[PDB]
């Protein structure tokens, strides 16, 4: 995907590699080498008038 | 999913303060001048 990765304040169980919100989109991943949990923020977008 | 996937919510043109000001004007008009300001 595409996004901005930041340090997460979420606590994942050791099994879980990524998470999802109520609308089933991905919003967090576990780095496969360091096991740190990172939040994914979509890159800014919007309309232009 | 701050703005989901291309779905943007737009603000109203009249803010809550501006609507409150219209309501205040309507109340002041009715209370001090009754039916004549309409």
Swiss-Prot record, chain A:
Quaternary state and interactors: Binds to host ACE2. RBD also interacts with the N-linked glycan on 'Asn-90' of ACE2. Cleavage of S generates a polybasic C-terminal sequence on S1 that binds to host Neuropilin-1 (NRP1) and Neuropilin-2 (NRP2) receptors. Interacts with host integrin alpha-5/beta-1 (ITGA5:ITGB1) and with ACE2 in complex with integrin alpha-5/beta-1 (ITGA5:ITGB1). May interact via cytoplasmic c-terminus with M protein. May interact (via N-terminus) with host bilirubin and biliverdin, thereby preventing antibody binding to the SARS-CoV-2 spike NTD via an allosteric mechanism.
Q: Which organism is it from?
A: Severe acute respiratory syndrome coronavirus 2
Output this protein's name. Spike protein S1
User: What is the covered span of the full protein?
Assistant: 548 to 596 of 1273
Protein function = Attaches the virion to the cell membrane by interacting with host receptor, initiating the infection. The major receptor is host ACE2. When S2/S2' has been cleaved, binding to the receptor triggers direct fusion at the cell membrane. When S2/S2' has not been cleaved, binding to the receptor results in internalization of the virus by endocytosis using host TFRC and GRM2 and leading to fusion of the virion membrane with the host endosomal membrane. Alternatively, may use NRP1/NRP2 and integrin as entry receptors.
């Amino acid at each position: 995907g595409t996004g901005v990765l930041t340090k997460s304040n979420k606590k994942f169980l050791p099994f879980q590699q990524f998470g999802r919100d109520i609308v089933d989109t991905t919003d967090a991943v576990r780095d496969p080498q360091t096991l740190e949990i990172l939040d994914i923020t979509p890159c800014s977008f919007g309309g232009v008038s | 999913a701050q703005k989901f996937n291309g779905l943007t919510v737009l603000p109203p043109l009249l803010t809550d303060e501006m609507i409150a000001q219209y309501t205040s004007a309507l109340l002041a008009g009715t209370i001090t001048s009754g039916w004549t300001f309409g």
